[PDB]
Amino acid sequence: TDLIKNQCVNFNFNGLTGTGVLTPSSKRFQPFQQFGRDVSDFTDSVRD
Amino acid sequence: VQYGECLGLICAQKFNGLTVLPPLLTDDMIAAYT
Ligand SMILES: *[C@@H]1O[C@H](CO)[C@@H](O[C@@H]2O[C@H](CO)[C@@H](O[C@@H]3O[C@H](CO)[C@@H](O)[C@H](O)[C@@H]3O)[C@H](O)[C@H]2NC(C)=O)[C@H](O)[C@H]1NC(C)=O
Numbered sequence: 001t002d003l004i005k006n007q008c009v010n011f012n013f014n015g016l017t018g019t020g021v022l023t024p025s026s027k028r029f030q031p032f033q034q035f036g037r038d039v040s041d042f043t044d045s046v047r048d
Numbered sequence: 049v050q051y052g053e054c055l056g057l058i059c060a061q062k063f064n065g066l067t068v069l070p071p072l073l074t075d076d077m078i079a080a081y082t
Contacts (some may be wrong), residue, residue: 031062039050042063 013046 035046052067
């Protein structure tokens with residue numbers, strides 16, 4: 001499906017589920033990374 | 049001289065449900081007293 005950015009939405013990315021507000025970022029992910037985490041054990045960001 | 053907070057004005061929150069409330073008296077007000 002498509003998605004709405006900058007809005008509270010329910011997400012179900014392949015292999016990743018939860019709720020929140022999705023916004024564009026600039027995190028320097030490596031070619032072999034799918035998603036990242038915060039200092040706490042919570043997903044911080046995901047690559048589409 | 050983590051948690052949700054807000055400065056300025058921009059705010060942010062954390063999935064852990066924790067935050068910190070502001071003081072009534074800001075640093076400037078304290079400086080005024082002293
Ligand atoms: C709550 O979110 C709104 C927007 O979603 C924030 O209001 C926006 O604040 C900026 C800065 O004061 C306003 O001015 C903008 O400045 C940028 C700087 O380059 C400029 O490019 C924009 O065209 C605009 O001038 C912006 O107009 C304003 N938006 C609205 C609708 O008022 C607000 O500050 C946020 N508040 C908190 C506590 O996060």
